[PDB]
Design a protein around this ligand. Structure first.
Ligand SMILES: *[C@@H]1O[C@H](CO)[C@@H](O[C@@H]2O[C@H](CO)[C@@H](O)[C@H](O)[C@H]2NC(C)=O)[C@H](O)[C@H]1NC(C)=O
Ligand SMILES: *[C@@H]1O[C@H](CO)[C@@H](O)[C@H](O)[C@H]1NC(C)=O
Ligand SMILES: [Cl-]
Ligand SMILES: [Zn+2]
Lengths: 593, 188
């Protein structure tokens, strides 16, 4: 039995060194894009990649059932996975090549305007600006279609081989398909009453989705009525919503629709972006002020190596940087944040999400290397959101000094706030399920490749209530038009993390002894509730996610009740507005016919 | 004459924790004023005797044990610890009588490419006795039959390297530790 105990102590000391060679090399690329750094980010990771496979096979010789201490059982299963090297020699390189070819044409994808051929825009910030601010139905129709017809159709032949090759990877790893490969994240095979099946994931997300439909169907009817004023004669009062009028490229978030669907736009806006500029704030002031939020609840400060090795601003003066905000846990106590912070309220709240990732990383640092990870794929993104939920409340903005102390918090300002939160939180729930349900069936083989796009839009209207503006045959690849689909990223984590972020908030505000509504809770000054989250952040990947969730919320599974209580004042207000409107949508209307 | 404490503290090269060296202090007066009137040490943790009584005290002989561990392995140089450094590299007796001084040396012991000179023992059958020293590189046989001098499956090398980097966190930065043991000729 001790034979496996020394094996892990050999891995946990040698993997940390190799995982720091790759983690430090990956930072040198995202902070200094150079063709030379492409090799260092790759080669230092390939040596690490060749190490995990040699140790996964050596750990696989150990009899898994012949363990007795629980800390060692869970460490071996993290290495018991076969991985992706079960594929053939030549098919492993072609499958790895199409992943790059899909990831490149997603970023290199540029479309040119027929009215102005010299102007050719990219996805960011070219097409995304048109989908996020333009009000021309035809201009939004072009950017939506040109992305799916010029760069989406290029992903179609690659994605057909992407599915057939990665299914072979999963079917050889004792899985049913690549869709089953991703559902193994929530799988638990251990303590009595804490186990969880891979197929149970499908049953739970569908069961908890039914309590979301009453709230979402009223948001859909309210947004459609407001959108009928912005785009008249283009929207049916009973039909679905056009895909290009949802606020972004794919209709994932309806956040940009707040300028069109605001309940009481006459009141002063809560975007405190202007107040940050006239106070001479920089990226230092934002992260330093965010540091004060974590220290107020008992959590440690940001280490000096963080303030000295993190990229808090756009580099400038001679460098290239992937400006996507990411929180990095390189190991060896090295914690950094790579983000091109602007002097805006959106980047002010993003610093609270990304530093929330670091606080989780700093907590489980005592866990072994194999156990240093979130409870599940959605636990990390839920920890970052509960930080931004408390930081976005007016009581927190006024206490920091950004909002005016005489800001009137009427019952109408809370409806405007809950409506803005609904356009981002509850608006993405049907889109996330329908997207992952499509890939779950495509991997399952229920959707043949000669009708991938027919069933994709048949679920857009049924699940999300969204209609395509122009008909699409099978040459299109609208699913892969999103980042997570064309870059091999699971998407169900964004659905589970949303329900996790409200079970955490309700459980933490009860420990913080909050009294008002859930949307007015600020967990600042709460060293009592800060220890309650500390108890689960230190857990890491040791105990199953069912147990880590139970340590804070007291439940073994996800629950939709906290989310509905957060939007309860808005849900009652949406049912009042839609009394003379039509709640629901017809899956047969289309903007062409 | 005074005791040469500079030959162990301000020493140029420090040994690994598994091969820590010991130096005997004989007939000489000890100068604890420089150690006390200096914030250069990061810990300065004493056991058995207080930090202010040894000034006007006499001992039979004093021993200084110098080595280097990581930041998190400094807390294991204390009586009653069960870490890797305590069990397999350097164990202090429960009746220890002396002080343990440490200070951060990332500026000298951590190069850009990582300084892998400092090592530590990771595998050893049974734990180390108090003040015991083991510098054997014999191949550690884990489970069944031995290894015939050859490493492999269930056959691991006993020693492993630290490799301190400048970007390492404060708990992964190198620290030079000096353990001053008082055994009951060396007054103050
Ligand atoms: C709790 O956190 C709040 C911020 O949310 C702190 O409130 C500010 O504290 C500073 C320093 O004392 C004052 O200058 C501000 O006027 C306070 N703003 C308020 C009260 O809105 C507070 O100090 C923290 N600690 C305690 C014990 O409340
Ligand atoms: C970026 O990396 C290259 C090598 O890939 C190096 O020569 C250059 O100095 C680096 N620049 C900065 C600003 O770090
Ligand atoms: Cl879409
Ligand atoms: Zn995140």
């Amino acid at each position: 039995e001790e034979n496996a105990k020394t094996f892990l102590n050999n891995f946990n000391q040698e993997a940390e060194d190799l995982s720091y060679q790759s983690s430090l090399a990956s930072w040198n690329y995202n902070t200094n894009i150079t063709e030379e750094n492409v090799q260092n980010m790759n080669n230092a990771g390939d040596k690490w990649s060749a190490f995990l496979k040699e140790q996964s096979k050596t750990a696989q010789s150990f009899s898994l059932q012949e363990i007795q201490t629980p800390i060692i059982k869970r460490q071996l299963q993290a290495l018991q996975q076969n991985g992706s090297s079960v594929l053939s020699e030549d098919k492993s390189k072609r499958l790895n090549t199409i992943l790059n070819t899909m990831s490149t044409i997603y970023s290199t994808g540029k479309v040119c305007n027929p009215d102005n051929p010299q102007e050719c825009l990219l996805l960011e910030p070219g097409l995304n600006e048109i989908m996020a601010n333009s009000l021309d139905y035809n201009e939004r129709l072009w950017a939506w279609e040109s992305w799916r017809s010029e760069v989406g159709k290029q992903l179609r032949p690659l994605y057909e081989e992407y599915v057939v090759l990665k299914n072979e990877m999963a079917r050889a790893n004792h899985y049913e398909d690549y869709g089953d490969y991703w559902r193994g994240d929530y799988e638990v095979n251990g303590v009595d009453g804490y186990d969880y099946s891979r197929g149970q994931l499908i049953e739970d997300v569908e069961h908890t989705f039914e309590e979301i439909k009453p709230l979402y169907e009223h948001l859909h009817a309210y947004v459609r009525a407001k959108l009928m004023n912005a785009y008249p004669s283009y929207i049916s009062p009973i039909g679905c919503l056009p895909a290009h009028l949802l606020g972004d490229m794919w209709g994932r978030f309806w956040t940009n629709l707040y300028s069109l669907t605001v309940p009481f736009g006459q009141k002063p806006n809560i975007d405190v972006t202007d107040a940050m500029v006239d106070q001479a704030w920089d990226a230092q002031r934002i992260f330093k002020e965010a540091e004060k939020f974590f220290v107020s609840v008992g959590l440690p400060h940001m280490t000096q190596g963080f303030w000295a090795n993190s990229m808090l601003t756009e580099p400038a003066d001679g460098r290239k940087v992937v400006c996507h905000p990411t929180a990095w846990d390189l190991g060896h106590g090295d914690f950094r944040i790579k983000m091109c912070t602007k002097v805006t309220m959106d980047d002010f709240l993003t610093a609270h999400h990304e530093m929330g990732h670091i606080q989780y990383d700093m907590a489980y640092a005592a866990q072994p290397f194999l156990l240093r990870n979130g409870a599940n794929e959605g636990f990390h993104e839920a920890v970052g959101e509960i930080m931004s939920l408390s930081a976005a409340t007016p009581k927190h903005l006024k206490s920091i000094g950004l909002l005016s102390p005489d800001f009137q918090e009427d019952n109408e300002t809370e409806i405007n706030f809950l409506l803005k939160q609904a356009l981002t939180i509850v608006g993405t729930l049907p889109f996330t399920y329908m997207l992952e349900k499509w890939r779950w069936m495509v991997f399952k083989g229920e959707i043949p490749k000669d009708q991938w796009m027919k069933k994709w839009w048949e679920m857009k209207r049924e699940i999300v209530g969204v209609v395509e503006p122009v008909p699409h045959d099978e040459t299109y690849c609208d699913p892969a038009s999103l980042f997570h689909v064309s870059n091999d990223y699971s998407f169900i984590r964004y659905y589970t993390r949303t329900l996790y972020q409200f079970q955490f908030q309700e459980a933490l505000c009860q420990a913080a002894k909050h009294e008002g509504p859930l949307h007015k809770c600020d967990i600042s000054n709460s060293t009592e509730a800060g220890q309650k989250l500390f108890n689960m952040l230190r857990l890491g990947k040791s105990e199953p996610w069912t147990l880590a969730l139970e340590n804070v919320v007291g439940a073994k599974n996800m629950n939709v009740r906290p989310l509905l209580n957060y939007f309860e004042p808005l849900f009652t207000w949406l049912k009042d507005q839609n009394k003379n409107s039509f709640v629901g949508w017809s899956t047969d209307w289309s903007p062409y016919a | 004459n005074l005791c040469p404490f500079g030959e162990v503290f301000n020493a140029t090269k420090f040994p690994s924790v598994y091969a820590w060296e010991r130096k005997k202090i004989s007939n000489c007066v000890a100068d604890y004023s420089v150690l006390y009137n200096s914030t250069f040490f990061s810990t300065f943790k004493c056991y058995g005797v207080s930090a202010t009584k040894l000034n006007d005290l006499c001992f039979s002989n004093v021993y200084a044990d110098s080595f280097v561990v990581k930041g998190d392995d400094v807390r294991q140089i204390a009586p009653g610890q069960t870490g890797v450094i305590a069990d397999y590299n350097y164990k202090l007796p429960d009746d220890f009588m002396g002080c343990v001084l440490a200070w951060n040396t990332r500026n000298i012991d951590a190069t850009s490419t990582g300084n892998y000179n400092y090592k530590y023992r990771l595998f050893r059958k049974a734990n180390l006795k108090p003040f015991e020293r083991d510098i054997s590189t014999e191949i550690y046989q884990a489970g069944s039959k031995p290894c015939n001098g050859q490493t492999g499956l269930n056959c691991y090398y006993p020693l492993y390297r630290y490799g301190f980097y400048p970007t390492d966190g404060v708990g992964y930065q190198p620290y030079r530790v000096v353990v001053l043991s008082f055994e009951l000729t060396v007054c103050g």
